[PDB]
Amino acid sequence: LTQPPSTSGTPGQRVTISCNIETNTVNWYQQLPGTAPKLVMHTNNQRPSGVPDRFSGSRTSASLAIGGLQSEDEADYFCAAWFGGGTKLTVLGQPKAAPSVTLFPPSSEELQANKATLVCLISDFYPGAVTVAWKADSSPVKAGVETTTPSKQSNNKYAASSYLSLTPEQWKSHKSYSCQVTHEGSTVEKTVAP
Amino acid sequence: LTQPPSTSGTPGQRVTISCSGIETNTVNWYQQLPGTAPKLVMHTNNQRPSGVPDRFSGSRSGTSASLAIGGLQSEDEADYFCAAWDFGGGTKLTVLGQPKAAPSVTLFPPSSEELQANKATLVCLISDFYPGAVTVAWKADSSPVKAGVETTTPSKQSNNKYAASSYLSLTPEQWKSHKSYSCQVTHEGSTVEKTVAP
């Protein structure tokens, strides 16, 4: 069972995945990253419940047609009969979306534990690429930064977070700290203070 | 089919993977290395397909199942799925490549600026852990909460340990009605639980 390893389409379109079998029937599985494979097609053409009507399958070869392409259809699709390699389906032309930024100062609990951490929460953006710079007062912060790789979430938009570690004495010695998130050549800045 | 989120071992050990639910029906086990299609490694409780090594052995006791992997070898790091009739969530199996490390867990109350916008979000920061797999459970006062919970998938930071964060979206009325909120992180079978209060 060999499959094309990738394919793509734009929302509203119709895409199909191509795929011992001449006698037996073919099943299809949809798998999202970090998730168990989910059956979406039965004895060539019967859908499990919960699978939308947009999905139809047909059958030495077998095919999975996906109608009215949506962002949530982005996935790996495997052929199976009595598994194929896989087909990663990419939904292109999804809308751009600027990020939501929320900056959290160190809590009284942490500062009492003689530590201090700031979190810059970044969510609800697309595409999944950002850059982060920090600022102490108005000056660059060049030490103690980590920014996670953005991962797609339920709402089909990306989320990441950047954190900064300081001593309590630094967080008070300054007047404010700032987190600046650049997404598609447009920047958003948030500031917190003691 | 309940199935533990993650497990781990070092080369040469015997590692087992559990699966529970299935008393009147058999269980299959699937191996999926990164970037590959799921492969059948065990059917009808304990029947090894052709090219599976002897060291894989399936069993089933009561209404629970198990897959044991003897002589753990680096080519076995993968996801393992159990699949019975009337698919488990999976188990991430890691062949330890560095010393295990338990996560730092830091919980934040909502920020001053976002309340003035009718938003109240909690953040549970999770850093410095290996292997890179955790599960997060939020609780309001003493009650489970899943409405509005989003967790980022972990990524390797500069100390070669992993980091992630879970965040809870609430209104300010939810945030002010409860006496406390809790974040619990489970890693390598252990839990840590931090708590906040307005």
Numbering used by the authors:
A (entry chain A): 4 to 22, 28 to 67, 70 to 92, 101 to 212
B (entry chain B): 4 to 24, 29 to 93, 101 to 212
Task: Please give sentences taken from the publication describing this entry.
LCs were distributed in two groups: a set of eight amyloidogenic LCs responsible for severe cardiac involvement and symptoms in patients (hereafter, H LC), and a set of five non amyloidogenic LCs isolated from patients affected by multiple myeloma for which no amyloid aggregation or proteotoxicity was observed in patients (hereafter, M LC). The crystal structures were all refined to satisfactory refinement parameters; in all cases the LCs were dimeric, with an overall quaternary arrangement closely matching that of the previously reported LC dimers. CL domains (res 115–214) are typically characterized by high quality electron density, are all very well superposable, and the dimeric CL–CL arrangement is clearly conserved in all the analysed structures (root mean square deviations -r.m.s.d.- generally fall below 1.0 Å over the entire CL–CL dimer - Table S3A and Fig. 4B-bottom).
Interestingly, most LCs show a one-step unfolding process, but three H LCs (H3, H6, H7) and one M LC (M9) display a two-step process, observed both in Far- and Near-UV temperature ramps. Inspection of the SDS-PAGE gels shows that the proteolysis pattern is different in different H LCs, suggesting that the sequence of proteolytic events, and not only their kinetics, may be characteristic of each H LC. Firstly, and somewhat unexpectedly, the most temperature- and trypsin-sensitive LCs (H3, H6, H7, H9) could be successfully crystallized. In H6 and M8 dimers all six CDRs (three for each LC monomer) are traceable in the electron density; in H9 and H10 five out of six are traceable, in H7 three, and in H3 and M7 only two CRDs are traceable. In the structures of all H LCs and in M7, the association interface is roughly symmetric, and is located on the five-stranded beta sheet (strands 1, 3, 4, 7, 8), where the 3, 4, 7, 8 strands establish the intermolecular contacts.
